[PDB]
Amino acid sequence: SMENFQKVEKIGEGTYGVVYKARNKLTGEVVALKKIRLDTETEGVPSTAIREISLLKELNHPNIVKLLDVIHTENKLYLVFEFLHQDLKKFMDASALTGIPLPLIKSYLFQLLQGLAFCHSHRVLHRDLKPQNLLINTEGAIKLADFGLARAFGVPVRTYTHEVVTLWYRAPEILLGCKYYSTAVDIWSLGCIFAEMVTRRALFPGDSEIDQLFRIFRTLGTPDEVVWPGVTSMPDYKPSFPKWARQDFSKVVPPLDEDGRSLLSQMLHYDPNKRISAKAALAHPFFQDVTKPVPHLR
Amino acid sequence: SPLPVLSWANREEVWKIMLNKEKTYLRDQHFLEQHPLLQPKMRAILLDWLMEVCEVYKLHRETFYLAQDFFDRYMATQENVVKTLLQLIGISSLFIAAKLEEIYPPKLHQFAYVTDGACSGDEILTMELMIMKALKWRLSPLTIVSWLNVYMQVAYLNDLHEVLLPQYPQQIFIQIAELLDLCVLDVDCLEFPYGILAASALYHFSSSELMQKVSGYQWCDIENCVKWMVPFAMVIRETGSSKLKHFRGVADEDAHNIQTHRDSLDLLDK
């Protein structure tokens, strides 16, 4: 329970409560607490908290923020998590004049893809990957955080919540109103994040759904039935969209080599059926000076 | 290894985690021994009523099966429950499940309302917390019907090997689900792994070769279950199967996922 923690600092707030940095009195251990005030809630334990708790109870991985405990202490529900230093947004902003060194960018992407490969193999869509939900420590680790918008997916999927992912990081199959979306949506967000680490500028910083789509179209070229079977039959496709040609990645992401460009290009494939998986991304040559394949059994 | 090569992960890995989650989610066929004042037909009456509320609210089969599972697992952690506490524990398992599973679940006052006065919002609130803490917040099982979902997808797999895009006949799925809904009403189903129940039901509507190809179980994995299922299959076969329904406000491509209710209690006597 709650006696032995003390709140050091308020570090966040959302619809369903407040986040604190907290410290254990003579253990020295620091944690993040999400505090839900149940007396304030009209449907109890918000659906987002039930999902965040249940999902993270079964997702233990070095690159996934650990849920350490859940404490019910009357009128209140506390989720206790490992505390991490900061936020990839804040780290990117602090590094914006200097650049994040390429080897660190590569390390961070590799670790993000390991944590995401893990979610996806356990049938969990994150659905809110953006730099502020990627937490870093002082030892070079990075981790997926804030599973408040995640959900278990079935095989096959069915229609899920449409209002998903922060705009800048939102995949075109969501923006074009597809009946179904899958794991491909999280890879899209990471491909946006990768380029953002490289350029120190958000790749597609839209201010509305249609501006977002047009930003994507102008960079990657307006999709058609050849690159993306079915686009023209999607609920929010319009024949009137302008027909932009794909921009060469040499100009989109100048610091990147051929491997980096190839990876990034596979992460931003229009067609969710062709967009690279987190697992296949790990085997990409970009990560040769990082990793090796495990022996293949037939 | 019923799964195809996956576009999102390692099929060996995915299937193994699926198999292994099935082994952290413990079920107990004799759990009502802990509740001497209860009888198996109370459990079936309770579960049957939940199926009917699900249909009234057009909740998904996955939400009924979550609620069924939370209920059975909760009761195994508990010791002396009385008939009159059942409706609270059941509608509260349903409330958790609907918040987890639905885009727009019924509101708490709607779950109070459907008990016709017997449970208040405040009581459902108290009870969901008791249920979740007692389950140690393990609220992500692979239910009976999710396995049927998996199996049907593989059954109808193309040479374009995408398993995640729904691509099977709505009307046949409904017919196997209706057998499983009968079989969950009998508490001895809990002796067979959820994936076996779903395999055995599909077998009864098809064959051993289909069953085997879509759920990698050999026939001997299934044989015991198949034998137990026999009476239930026959009663269903005798009566004939239901027609796929339309539901107001629900997309037709989602219609087979809506939980339905028939007189399964009558059918359970035979």
Coordinates of C-alpha atoms in Angstrom, one line a residue, chain B residues 14-259:
Chain B
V14 CA 2.6 -16.1 -31.8
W15 CA 1.1 -19.6 -31.5
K16 CA 3.3 -20.6 -28.6
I17 CA 2.4 -17.5 -26.6
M18 CA -1.2 -18.3 -27.3
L19 CA -0.7 -21.9 -26.2
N20 CA 1.2 -20.7 -23.1
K21 CA -1.2 -18.1 -22.0
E22 CA -3.8 -20.9 -22.0
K23 CA -1.6 -22.4 -19.2
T24 CA -1.6 -19.4 -16.9
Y25 CA -5.3 -19.1 -17.1
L26 CA -6.4 -21.9 -14.8
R27 CA -9.9 -23.3 -14.9
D28 CA -11.5 -25.9 -12.5
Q29 CA -14.4 -28.2 -13.4
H30 CA -15.2 -28.8 -9.7
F31 CA -15.1 -25.3 -8.4
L32 CA -18.7 -25.3 -7.1
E33 CA -17.6 -27.8 -4.5
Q34 CA -16.3 -24.7 -2.7
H35 CA -19.9 -23.4 -2.7
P36 CA -22.1 -26.1 -1.1
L37 CA -25.2 -24.0 -1.3
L38 CA -24.8 -23.8 -5.1
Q39 CA -25.7 -26.4 -7.8
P40 CA -24.5 -26.5 -11.4
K41 CA -27.9 -25.4 -12.9
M42 CA -27.5 -22.0 -11.0
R43 CA -24.3 -21.4 -12.9
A44 CA -26.0 -22.3 -16.2
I45 CA -29.0 -20.1 -15.4
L46 CA -26.7 -17.3 -14.6
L47 CA -24.6 -17.7 -17.7
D48 CA -27.8 -18.1 -19.9
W49 CA -29.2 -14.9 -18.6
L50 CA -25.9 -13.1 -19.3
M51 CA -26.1 -14.3 -23.0
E52 CA -29.5 -12.7 -23.1
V53 CA -28.4 -9.4 -21.7
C54 CA -25.5 -9.5 -24.3
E55 CA -28.0 -9.9 -27.1
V56 CA -30.3 -7.1 -25.8
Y57 CA -27.3 -4.8 -25.7
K58 CA -25.8 -6.2 -29.0
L59 CA -22.6 -7.0 -27.2
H60 CA -20.0 -9.2 -28.9
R61 CA -19.6 -12.9 -28.3
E62 CA -16.1 -12.1 -27.1
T63 CA -17.6 -10.0 -24.3
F64 CA -19.9 -12.8 -23.2
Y65 CA -17.0 -15.3 -23.1
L66 CA -14.8 -12.9 -21.1
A67 CA -17.6 -12.5 -18.6
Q68 CA -18.1 -16.3 -18.5
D69 CA -14.4 -16.7 -17.9
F70 CA -14.0 -13.9 -15.2
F71 CA -17.0 -15.5 -13.5
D72 CA -15.7 -19.1 -13.4
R73 CA -12.2 -18.0 -12.4
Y74 CA -13.4 -15.6 -9.7
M75 CA -15.6 -18.3 -8.1
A76 CA -12.6 -20.6 -7.8
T77 CA -10.8 -18.0 -5.7
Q78 CA -14.0 -17.8 -3.5
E79 CA -15.5 -20.0 -0.8
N80 CA -19.2 -19.8 0.3
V81 CA -21.3 -17.9 -2.2
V82 CA -25.1 -18.0 -2.0
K83 CA -27.6 -18.0 -4.8
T84 CA -28.5 -14.4 -4.2
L85 CA -25.0 -13.1 -4.8
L86 CA -24.8 -14.7 -8.3
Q87 CA -26.5 -11.9 -10.3
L88 CA -24.1 -9.3 -8.8
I89 CA -21.0 -11.3 -9.5
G90 CA -22.2 -12.1 -13.1
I91 CA -23.4 -8.6 -14.2
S92 CA -20.1 -7.2 -12.7
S93 CA -18.0 -9.7 -14.7
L94 CA -20.0 -8.6 -17.7
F95 CA -19.4 -4.8 -16.8
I96 CA -15.6 -5.4 -16.7
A97 CA -15.7 -7.4 -20.0
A98 CA -17.8 -4.8 -21.9
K99 CA -15.4 -1.9 -20.8
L100 CA -12.5 -4.0 -22.0
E101 CA -14.0 -5.3 -25.3
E102 CA -16.6 -2.7 -26.7
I103 CA -15.9 0.6 -28.4
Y104 CA -19.0 2.1 -26.6
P105 CA -20.0 -0.3 -23.8
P106 CA -23.4 0.2 -22.0
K107 CA -23.0 2.6 -19.1
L108 CA -23.0 1.5 -15.5
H109 CA -26.6 2.7 -15.0
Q110 CA -27.5 0.4 -17.9
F111 CA -25.9 -2.6 -16.1
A112 CA -27.8 -1.6 -12.9
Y113 CA -31.0 -1.3 -14.9
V114 CA -30.9 -4.8 -16.6
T115 CA -30.9 -6.5 -13.1
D116 CA -34.4 -5.1 -12.7
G117 CA -33.5 -3.4 -9.3
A118 CA -31.5 -6.3 -7.7
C119 CA -28.1 -4.7 -8.0
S120 CA -27.2 -1.0 -7.7
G121 CA -24.4 0.8 -9.5
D122 CA -22.4 1.2 -6.3
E123 CA -22.6 -2.6 -5.7
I124 CA -21.4 -3.3 -9.3
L125 CA -18.6 -0.8 -8.6
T126 CA -17.6 -2.6 -5.3
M127 CA -17.8 -6.0 -7.0
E128 CA -15.8 -5.3 -10.1
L129 CA -12.9 -4.3 -7.9
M130 CA -13.3 -7.5 -5.8
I131 CA -13.3 -9.6 -9.1
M132 CA -10.3 -7.8 -10.7
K133 CA -8.1 -7.9 -7.5
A134 CA -9.0 -11.6 -6.9
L135 CA -8.0 -12.4 -10.5
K136 CA -4.8 -10.5 -9.9
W137 CA -5.8 -8.3 -12.9
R138 CA -5.4 -11.2 -15.4
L139 CA -8.3 -10.2 -17.6
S140 CA -6.8 -11.1 -21.0
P141 CA -7.6 -14.8 -21.6
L142 CA -8.0 -16.6 -24.8
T143 CA -11.8 -17.4 -24.6
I144 CA -13.7 -20.3 -26.1
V145 CA -15.0 -18.1 -29.0
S146 CA -11.7 -16.4 -29.8
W147 CA -10.3 -19.9 -30.6
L148 CA -13.2 -20.4 -32.9
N149 CA -12.4 -17.1 -34.5
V150 CA -8.8 -18.2 -35.1
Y151 CA -9.9 -21.7 -36.5
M152 CA -12.4 -20.2 -38.9
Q153 CA -9.8 -17.8 -40.3
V154 CA -7.4 -20.6 -41.0
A155 CA -10.2 -22.7 -42.5
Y156 CA -10.8 -20.1 -45.1
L157 CA -7.2 -19.1 -45.7
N158 CA -6.3 -18.0 -49.3
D159 CA -3.1 -18.2 -51.3
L160 CA -2.9 -14.6 -50.2
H161 CA -1.9 -15.6 -46.6
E162 CA -3.4 -12.8 -44.4
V163 CA -4.9 -14.2 -41.2
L164 CA -5.7 -10.8 -39.6
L165 CA -8.3 -9.7 -42.2
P166 CA -11.7 -11.5 -41.5
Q167 CA -12.5 -13.8 -44.4
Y168 CA -14.9 -16.6 -43.4
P169 CA -18.7 -17.3 -43.8
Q170 CA -20.7 -15.6 -41.1
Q171 CA -23.5 -18.1 -41.1
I172 CA -21.4 -21.3 -40.3
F173 CA -19.5 -19.5 -37.5
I174 CA -22.9 -18.8 -35.8
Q175 CA -23.8 -22.4 -36.0
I176 CA -20.7 -23.7 -34.2
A177 CA -20.9 -20.8 -31.6
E178 CA -24.4 -21.9 -30.7
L179 CA -23.0 -25.4 -29.8
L180 CA -20.2 -23.9 -27.7
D181 CA -22.8 -21.6 -25.9
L182 CA -24.7 -24.8 -24.9
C183 CA -21.5 -26.6 -23.8
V184 CA -20.4 -23.6 -21.5
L185 CA -23.7 -23.9 -19.7
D186 CA -22.4 -27.3 -18.3
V187 CA -19.7 -26.7 -15.8
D188 CA -17.8 -30.0 -16.7
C189 CA -16.7 -28.2 -19.9
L190 CA -14.0 -26.7 -17.7
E191 CA -12.1 -29.9 -17.7
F192 CA -11.1 -29.3 -21.4
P193 CA -8.8 -26.4 -22.5
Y194 CA -10.8 -23.7 -24.2
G195 CA -9.0 -24.4 -27.5
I196 CA -10.1 -28.1 -27.2
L197 CA -13.7 -27.1 -26.7
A198 CA -13.6 -24.9 -29.7
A199 CA -11.8 -27.6 -31.7
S200 CA -14.2 -30.3 -30.7
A201 CA -17.2 -28.2 -31.6
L202 CA -15.8 -27.4 -35.0
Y203 CA -15.0 -31.1 -35.5
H204 CA -18.7 -31.9 -34.9
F205 CA -19.6 -29.6 -37.7
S206 CA -16.9 -30.8 -40.0
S207 CA -14.1 -33.4 -39.8
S208 CA -10.9 -34.5 -38.1
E209 CA -8.8 -33.3 -41.1
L210 CA -10.3 -29.8 -41.1
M211 CA -10.1 -29.6 -37.3
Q212 CA -6.5 -30.8 -37.4
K213 CA -5.4 -28.4 -40.2
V214 CA -7.0 -25.2 -38.5
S215 CA -6.2 -26.1 -34.8
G216 CA -3.0 -28.2 -34.8
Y217 CA -4.5 -30.8 -32.5
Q218 CA -4.3 -34.5 -33.4
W219 CA -7.5 -36.3 -33.0
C220 CA -6.5 -37.9 -29.7
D221 CA -6.1 -34.4 -28.1
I222 CA -9.8 -33.9 -29.0
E223 CA -11.2 -37.5 -28.5
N224 CA -12.2 -37.2 -24.8
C225 CA -13.8 -33.7 -25.3
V226 CA -15.5 -35.0 -28.5
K227 CA -17.0 -37.8 -26.4
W228 CA -18.2 -35.4 -23.7
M229 CA -19.6 -33.0 -26.4
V230 CA -21.5 -35.9 -28.2
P231 CA -24.9 -35.3 -26.4
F232 CA -24.8 -31.6 -26.9
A233 CA -24.0 -31.9 -30.6
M234 CA -26.8 -34.3 -31.0
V235 CA -29.4 -32.1 -29.3
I236 CA -28.3 -29.2 -31.6
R237 CA -28.3 -31.5 -34.7
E238 CA -31.8 -32.7 -33.7
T239 CA -33.2 -29.1 -33.5
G240 CA -31.3 -27.8 -36.5
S241 CA -29.2 -24.7 -36.5
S242 CA -30.0 -21.0 -36.3
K243 CA -30.0 -18.4 -39.1
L244 CA -27.6 -15.5 -39.1
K245 CA -29.3 -12.4 -37.7
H246 CA -29.3 -8.7 -38.6
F247 CA -28.9 -6.3 -35.7
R248 CA -29.9 -2.6 -35.9
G249 CA -27.0 -0.3 -35.9
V250 CA -24.5 -3.1 -36.4
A251 CA -22.5 -3.4 -39.7
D252 CA -23.5 -6.7 -41.6
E253 CA -19.8 -7.7 -41.8
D254 CA -19.8 -7.6 -37.9
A255 CA -23.2 -9.4 -37.4
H256 CA -21.9 -12.9 -36.7
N257 CA -19.8 -11.4 -33.8
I258 CA -23.0 -10.3 -32.0
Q259 CA -23.9 -12.5 -29.0

